[PDB]
Ligand binder design. Sequence first.
Ligand SMILES: COC(=O)c1cnc(N2CCN(C(=O)c3ccc(-c4nc5cccc(C(N)=O)c5[nH]4)cc3)CC2)nc1
Length: 340
Amino acid sequence: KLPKPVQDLIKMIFDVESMKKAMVEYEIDLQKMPLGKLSKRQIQAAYSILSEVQQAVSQGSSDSQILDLSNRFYTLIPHDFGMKKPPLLNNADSVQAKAEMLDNLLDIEVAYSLLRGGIDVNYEKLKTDIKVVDRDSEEAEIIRKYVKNTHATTHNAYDLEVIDIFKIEREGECQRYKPFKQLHNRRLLWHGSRTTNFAGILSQGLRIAPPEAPVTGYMFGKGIYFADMVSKSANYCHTSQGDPIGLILLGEVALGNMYELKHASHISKLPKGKHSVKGLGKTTPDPSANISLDGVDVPLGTGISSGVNDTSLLYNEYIVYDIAQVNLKYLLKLKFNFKT
Ligand SMILES: COC(=O)c1cnc(N2CCN(C(=O)c3ccc(-c4nc5cccc(C(N)=O)c5[nH]4)cc3)CC2)nc1
């Protein structure tokens, strides 16, 4: 009954094929730990094992206090390690991969638990209004200016192809966002993610990392992270040429007084007065070219110098610390054409 490209979208983000493939990747044992068996106790409780483990990554527990811990992680999240003894979780390079693993499992769990309980039926459980923006229109044309124009040259692994442009209103967000709709400095910014996560995103909104989750890797702490160049968000689609179709959001995020840092602070509470963090990049879109939809900054100028030496970022990052500061506006279906 819905339009074709929206029916395809729901078959993309509820594809049980993708989910199983994403666990064979992470070397999870699907015999002991199938899709159904993924519960929310475990991921929180696995995260928990990546408190204590990290809680002795800087002291370095010693195997007397590591082995048992590194062990007790595999009780809940079993793995299938070829023929080589299980990689012992005793470094921050290891706990990174596992941090990103549970980060993904959590939304794969959301996707199943929605599909399993009670393609128009799966649309219902996304609790999101999904409407097609039409190619030839203007709304269509200023989204494409932004995608072609703010492609960064450091990101030369792919050309960016727009397939479908959807308009999105998640149930309850409009109300949640009224308080921040009157805040100054509001931007339509990019947010990329794995398509296995999008079941979780559309249904639950963009969340901040749970408190059980590790220290660092989080440059500007546990917040919702946006970019102004599509490439930077495009990269967190983690698409191979095996699966060359990604999903990237546009968000209205109400940034207000941006706290402007040029190196990592694990920001735990924002300064009285500040509403977001702005990681200052080397390159920033032509601020000349910044356009205005409905009292929202659409920064779609091409890359020029910010002029700003003495940053650890090649490109800007926006972070909020309140889920209510985001109001998701569009969802884009992209093809990744690769260059080698
Ligand atoms: C053990 O400590 C470590 O060394 C370590 C631990 N954990 C880690 N890691 C696990 C925890 N980490 C994250 O969940 C994380 C992932 C993505 C971003 C992010 N940044 C963005 C900037 C602009 C736009 C976007 C976007 N998606 O549009 C951005 N997304 C941020 C954080 C980070 C990686 N890495 C290292």
